[PDB]
């Protein structure tokens, strides 16, 4: 019955901002590692930004490290990603994800849930 509902997605100028948000039902985001996959491409789903179950530990996609911050909100049971500095590359469906462990893996399908996407585009 675990839901992740992303939203925050939609269409925005290179060199603009969008904030994307994850509610999540039949978990909490304090037991878990929350992480942010997006699929840049029809063969690749990329690791994007994790945050790890005690809520100090995170990671960034070499890629983003600088431009995206990703944050949670443990009584509004939410995973944000602030996305700044947008630039065309970072076209993709974006995915939130949870794993049991308190921290993200390397791979969504190895991570116990993951939802259904919200697609951000980028464009000149």
């Known amino acids: 019955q675990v839901q992740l509902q992303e939203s925050g997605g939609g269409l925005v100028q290179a060199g603009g901002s969008l904030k994307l948000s994850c509610t999540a039902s039949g978990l909490r985001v304090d037991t878990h590692g929350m992480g942010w996959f997006r699929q840049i491409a029809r063969k690749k789903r990329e690791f994007v930004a994790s945050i790890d179950w005690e809520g100090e530990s995170t990671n960034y996609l070499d890629s983003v490290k600088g431009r995206f911050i990703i944050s949670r909100d443990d009584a509004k049971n939410t995973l944000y990603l602030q996305m700044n500095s947008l630039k065309p590359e970072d076209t993709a469906v974006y995915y939130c994800?949870?794993?049991?462990?308190?921290?993200?893996?390397?791979?969504?399908?190895?991570?116990?849930?993951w939802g259904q996407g919200t697609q951000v585009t980028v464009s000149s």
């Open positions: 994800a949870a794993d049991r462990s308190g921290r993200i893996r390397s791979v969504v399908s190895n991570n116990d849930y």
